[PDB]
């Protein structure tokens, strides 16, 4: 009898890109919005994973 | 929502209720069956120390 070990899944990590970059900051968030969808796209990619 | 003639015919109030939040997040007036992440619940400060 032999044992074969294979991974199946990753930890389902999800990162809030706005909180990560501009935590509790209105002034920072307003500047972050000048980058358009970059923040949203990152959240989407992690959701997909 | 702007129609073919450039007239605003509808709108979503992005802070009215949780479904409106989903419609706003997905940039659509139609939401398909499923679970969507739309926001981040945050307790606000009540005192200034
Ligand atoms: C645009 O205007 C024309 C009249 O010139 C009307 O017949 C048509 O239905 C209008 N389009 C929309 C989307 O309301």
Curated annotation (Swiss-Prot), chain A:
Q: Which cysteine pairs make disulfide bonds?
A: 17-39, 22-28
| Top-level taxon in the UniProt lineage | Viruses
Summary of the function given for this chain in its UniProt record? Precursor of the fusion protein processed in the biosynthesis of the S protein and the formation of virus particle. Mediates fusion of the virion and cellular membranes by functioning as a class I viral fusion protein. Contains two viral fusion peptides that are unmasked after cleavage. The S2/S2' cleavage occurs during virus entry at the cell membrane by host TMPRSS2 or during endocytosis by host CSTL.
Q: What is this protein called?
A: Spike protein S2
* Provenance organism: Severe acute respiratory syndrome coronavirus 2
Residues shown, of full length: 722 to 770 of 1273
């Amino acid at each position: 009898v032999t044992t074969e070990i294979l991974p199946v899944s990753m930890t389902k990590t999800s990162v809030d890109c706005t909180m990560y970059i501009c935590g509790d900051s209105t002034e920072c968030s307003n500047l972050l919005l000048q980058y358009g969808s970059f923040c949203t796209q990152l959240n989407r990619a992690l959701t997909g994973i | 929502k702007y129609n073919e003639n450039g007239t605003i015919t509808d709108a979503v109030d992005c802070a009215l209720d949780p479904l409106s939040e989903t419609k706003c997040t997905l940039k659509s007036f139609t939401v398909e069956k499923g679970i969507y992440q739309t926001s981040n619940f945050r307790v606000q400060p009540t005192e200034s120390i």
